[PDB]
UniProtKB/Swiss-Prot annotation, chain B:
Disorder cited: Chromosomal aberrations involving NCOA2 may be a cause of acute myeloid leukemias. Inversion inv(8)(p11;q13) generates the KAT6A-NCOA2 oncogene, which consists of the N-terminal part of KAT6A and the C-terminal part of NCOA2/TIF2. KAT6A-NCOA2 binds to CREBBP and disrupts its function in transcription activation.
Motif (LXXLL motif 2): 3-7
Mod. after translation: Acetylated.
Domain comment (free text): Contains four Leu-Xaa-Xaa-Leu-Leu (LXXLL) motifs. The LXXLL motifs are essential for the association with nuclear receptors and are, at least in part, functionally redundant.
Family statement drawn from the similarity comment of this UniProt entry: Belongs to the SRC/p160 nuclear receptor coactivator family.
Top-level taxon in the UniProt lineage: Eukaryota
Function per UniProt: Transcriptional coactivator for steroid receptors and nuclear receptors. Coactivator of the steroid binding domain (AF-2) but not of the modulating N-terminal domain (AF-1). Required with NCOA1 to control energy balance between white and brown adipose tissues. Critical regulator of glucose metabolism regulation, acts as a RORA coactivator to specifically modulate G6PC1 expression. Involved in the positive regulation of the transcriptional activity of the glucocorticoid receptor NR3C1 by sumoylation enhancer RWDD3.
Compartments reported by the entry: Nucleus
Name of the molecule in the record: Nuclear receptor coactivator 2
From Swiss-Prot, chain C:
Residues carrying lipid (S-palmitoyl cysteine): C136
Residues with Phosphotyrosine modification: S212
Protein name: Estrogen receptor
Domain text: Composed of three domains: a modulating N-terminal domain, a DNA-binding domain and a C-terminal ligand-binding domain. The modulating domain, also known as A/B or AF-1 domain has a ligand-independent transactivation function. The C-terminus contains a ligand-dependent transactivation domain, also known as E/F or AF-2 domain which overlaps with the ligand binding domain. AF-1 and AF-2 activate transcription independently and synergistically and act in a promoter- and cell-specific manner. AF-1 seems to provide the major transactivation function in differentiated cells.
Annotated consequence of substituting Q66H: In ESTRR; results in highly reduced activity
Domain NR LBD: 6-222
Function comment: Nuclear hormone receptor. The steroid hormones and their receptors are involved in the regulation of eukaryotic gene expression and affect cellular proliferation and differentiation in target tissues. Ligand-dependent nuclear transactivation involves either direct homodimer binding to a palindromic estrogen response element (ERE) sequence or association with other DNA-binding transcription factors, such as AP-1/c-Jun, c-Fos, ATF-2, Sp1 and Sp3, to mediate ERE-independent signaling.
Gene: ESR1
From Swiss-Prot, chain D:
Record's function text: Transcriptional coactivator for steroid receptors and nuclear receptors. Coactivator of the steroid binding domain (AF-2) but not of the modulating N-terminal domain (AF-1). Required with NCOA1 to control energy balance between white and brown adipose tissues. Critical regulator of glucose metabolism regulation, acts as a RORA coactivator to specifically modulate G6PC1 expression. Involved in the positive regulation of the transcriptional activity of the glucocorticoid receptor NR3C1 by sumoylation enhancer RWDD3.
Domain-level remarks: Contains four Leu-Xaa-Xaa-Leu-Leu (LXXLL) motifs. The LXXLL motifs are essential for the association with nuclear receptors and are, at least in part, functionally redundant. The LLXXLXXXL motif is involved in transcriptional coactivation and CREBBP/CBP binding.
Protein name as catalogued: Nuclear receptor coactivator 2
Domain of life: Eukaryota
Organism listed in the record: Homo sapiens (Human)
Disease tied to this entry: Chromosomal aberrations involving NCOA2 may be a cause of acute myeloid leukemias. Inversion inv(8)(p11;q13) generates the KAT6A-NCOA2 oncogene, which consists of the N-terminal part of KAT6A and the C-terminal part of NCOA2/TIF2. KAT6A-NCOA2 binds to CREBBP and disrupts its function in transcription activation.
Segments carrying motif LXXLL motif 2: 3-7
Localization per record: Nucleus
Posttranslational modification: Acetylated.
């Protein structure tokens, strides 16, 4: 695995270069129309996520079966932290696309998404109050890809240690003290527990709300 | 699985 | 109070507040074992509530916030306690000193949750998790699981526990790189404990659609 | 709520 030999700055630049683009949605809403826009957007984002996963250092070194399992477990988590990251500079709103900026009242169009909408907004304000940097976001997103299905293995945890060395190396350049480094590291990783919670609650409605790829990704959680 | 196909292309 | 505690005083306070290891009324159906597990978890909830009171910084929170944190994390806390007791028993879950089950003894669909609990237990065993680190993680779960479902006071206590974890790893002879890696490794497991609790809460609601007055109100909190 | 009573 050439990922373990990479330095911290080489890890950051490899993650920044592998970032998928910000897609647009199809140019008021109802229950079936908003779900149609979100489904169509998420279905097209899956194709970029799969190619983004191949460019995550160490992911190719896994077997094809292990790659499928990690993507099947974390695909909604990765979509959410990306949505939360895009919505950072828009307090009180979720930026699904540059032309699809929704607020709380739009979440009431479908019965049961207001609860997930508020948690996504709280996560965005949490990143916003932390002044989360792009180099930190791409590290957290790759951690989700490797960690979310690791217990359902020595190489993955070795790569996870590399991203931790990458995260600490990023905080040291920002001028944080030793105490501030492990505190911010702990703060960022505890948010992943809430991202997992949002994905579990969101997935729960998604395979009750029921694209063949998006169905195979959805059936993997049943 | 479609995920198998997209992970090899 | 909590912010005016050393790392050593933080450890002793958490270790002193530990709840006891309860016994079950064991000695078998799928619904007879579920009765044993439900009866055990119900009695454990009484000790957990009094354990949460002794967690530094928890009493300072309002009654509504204390109810909220326990409603969201009660199954997570039970699971990490079960996983901690099962460390020295590979391939087995120690629900009670007289109740030790493996894969075969695992109810419709509970097998998937059993394997995840076992994988979490072996993960703690590979890390050689210390009791000083365990009581920190369990108190982190209590304060963090519902902090975004309602805050500056709670995050301040969480930073002190992180300082306590790093202080413990420095005593164990770990280098600075090893301290940050192990800290990250422990907190990523909490993401898996949240996953197990969500899947478990989903399976617990399906059984109610097929306990005691407290365990029902805890289940109704997750809708 | 029983949880509120036991906490009190
Ligand atoms: C298919 C499919 C897949 C995902 C989604 C979702 C998200 C999303 C996030 C980022 C992104 O780039 C694209 C989409 C977020 C949050 C909801 S969810 O994940 O909370 O979806 C629901 C939850 C409850 C109820 Br009721 C209805 C829908 C929805 O937008 C919706 C449909
Ligand atoms: C009700 C009710 C509540 C919990 C449980 C359970 C657990 C448990 C874990 C730790 C513990 O101390 C007690 C019980 C774990 C995992 C299952 S789960 O499938 O219920 O989760 C079951 O055993 C079963 C019924």
């Amino acid at each position: 695995s050439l990922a373990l030999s990479l330095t911290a700055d080489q890890m950051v630049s490899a993650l920044l270069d592998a970032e998928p683009p910000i897609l647009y949605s199809e140019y008021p809403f109802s229950e079936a129309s908003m779900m149609g826009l979100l489904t169509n957007l998420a279905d097209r984002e899956l194709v970029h996520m799969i190619n983004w996963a191949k460019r995550v250092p160490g992911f190719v070194d896994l077997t094809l079966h292990d790659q499928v399992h990690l993507l099947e477990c974390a695909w909604l988590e990765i979509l959410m932290i990306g949505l939360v990251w895009r919505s950072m500079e828009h307090p009180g709103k979720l930026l699904f696309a540059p032309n699809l900026l929704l607020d709380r009242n739009q979440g009431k169009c479908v019965e049961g998404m207001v609860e997930i909408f508020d948690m996504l907004l709280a996560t965005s304000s949490r990143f916003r109050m932390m002044n989360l940097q792009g180099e930190e976001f791409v590290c957290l997103k790759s951690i989700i890809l490797l960690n979310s299905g690791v217990y359902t293995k020595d190489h993955i945890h070795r790569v996870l240690d590399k991203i931790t060395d990458t995260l600490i190396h990023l905080m040291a350049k920002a001028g944080l003290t030793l105490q501030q480094q492990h505190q911010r590291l702990a703060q960022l990783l505890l948010i992943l527990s809430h991202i997992r919670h949002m994905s579990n609650k969101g997935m729960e409605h998604l395979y009750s709300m029921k694209s063949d790829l998006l169905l195979e990704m959805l059936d993997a959680h049943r | 699985k479609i995920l198998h196909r997209l992970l090899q292309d």
